[PDB]
Amino acid sequence: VATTPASSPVTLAETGSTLLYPLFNLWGPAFHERYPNVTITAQGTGSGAGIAQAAAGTVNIGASDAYLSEGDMAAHKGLMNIALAISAQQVNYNLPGVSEHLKLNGKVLAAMYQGTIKTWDDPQIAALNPGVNLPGTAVVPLHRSDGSGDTFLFTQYLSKQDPEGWGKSPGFGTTVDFPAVPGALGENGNGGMVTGCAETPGCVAYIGISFLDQASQRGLGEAQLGNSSGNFLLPDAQSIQAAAAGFASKTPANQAISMIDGPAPDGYPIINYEYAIVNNRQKDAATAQTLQAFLHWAITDGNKASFLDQVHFQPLPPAVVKLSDALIATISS
Template sequence: MFMKSIIGAAVLAAGISVASAADISGAGATFPYPIYAKWADMYKKETGLGLNYQSIGSGGGIKQIKNKTVTFGASDMPLEPKDLTASGLVQFPTVIGGDVPVVNLDGIGPGDLVLDGPTLADIFLGKITKWDDAAIKKLNPNAKLPSSAIVVVHRSDGSGTTFIFTDYLSKVSPDWKSNVGASTAVEWPVGIGAKGNEGVSNNVTQTKGAIGYVEFAYALETKMSTINMINRDGKAVVPSAAAFQAAAANADWEKSDNYFVILTDEPGAESWPIAGATFILMYKQPQDVANSAAALKFFDWAYSNGSKAAEDLHYVPLPAVVIAQIEKTWATQIKGPDGKPIFAK
């Protein structure tokens, strides 16, 4: 049932989970899965070439590309430049999106509650355990908050969505930073673990009093109750593509080292505080040149033809100047045994 209208057709038409010999293979982040599935469907219809993408979480994607079992890995956590160098990898962003807190409370719809960063952190730290806690009531004086227990739901797998979420909490809560930290997988103080954005969505949907975090497209498709957030500028913001774009407005991709850009807690009155880009990982000297060239051709096609599909799913397409920079990265860093670029426009 999950995301049937967006993903179901793509799975069947594009071979997103059933590979053929000619399919491009990739694995990793669940955060961009809705748009990768849509792009795969469109690309299959236009070229006949499928995409076998395993939505297994960023941790799994990093592991699989390092084990050389896929042509590309996908992660919402950008790798440090030193890690890329050590592994012989290159990374580049594809789209920008956002994590959103979601709840299951009777009488509470999308946007009916607002939280700030410290309060959200205290909930996930287990310091705030009831929905009618004074800290939540202070932020929501007109809401009818039950006295029921808060049930925290978090990712159980290695996840870039978790990295974005915990990176934000680390920036707004000293307790979170010192006791939990930011990573694709952390030691959660409290809560129920679930696999993938799908698992968190399902658990929150089925559990009264639950709170979790998912990528925005999942929340919209399943009609979950999202929470508005008070951002760095002290403004209450509704999650939206425009708010994600506002968060990315100050990103300096050109001067970043290997596109190492994190978009959480960005300044700006309209900025969504839990935004992030998602990234592709490939080898600089791939073993299978033909498949790697096919993957780059797919992403080049997506940059040129997939912006509307991305916007329809509430992702933010990359600016043209960033795409041009990425194409230069491909030409200068991803090469065959002869030292020549494996893909050129």
């Protein structure tokens, strides 16, 4: 693995995951400060564009919260997903006056997105939140309009917890045919989800953890999500470090692994690796070497708390760092 960038000016273009975007805005300047000859550009366009453009050769780095499907790998040989850090997703809602962190699970959320739960005081919700005065506000299940990693993560949670329902249809993916129910409205990017949700009381939205602060500032509630052990957790360092322990020794060599709804009793149900989608063959030697240098930097120096703590991510455990490096090292020209 090349740990030093070429000396000639090189530009690494990135695009994709709005979830990973805030972090790339920190990494980019830091690396550039260290190696002035290297220019890093990034844009928040959603995981879909990330996968699409990296595959088309339009950018050097596609950012994605979703791993490549077996189909994607077969269609674009040389394309791989390298883990860079661990992140998570929370479920925000707009219910002014409700102080508590409402408890929800994949079964109840699937019902909301399927239109069977139409109000916030529905029996299925009250059963999970005894003592809370739930309003009769109508539920408005919002979803991402653009191909999104958050959609992939959310719909996998729903699919795992509701195998016979959501699991069968519409299943999961970066783009999903959401049930056409009242309020099934589309919003662009995580920002759009925050903004959309804050707009009208009763909204529900799956939003990436790096937008947690913004969501709170807008006065949105944050749900406690139930895991398979019957526990309801908030996404924080503790619950994510606990959920990751479930897959630290079980990550495949190609790193395509779902860490959704794991077995850790105290683990948060929606965590995931953030991926750099990159092609095994680059423009020239200088560019291949610089991309390697940057990616290895990102998973070592870039994984320090000074960086990750700002967007609420956790670092990759060592065995995984090793696997990423092994993939970084195949980047040639």
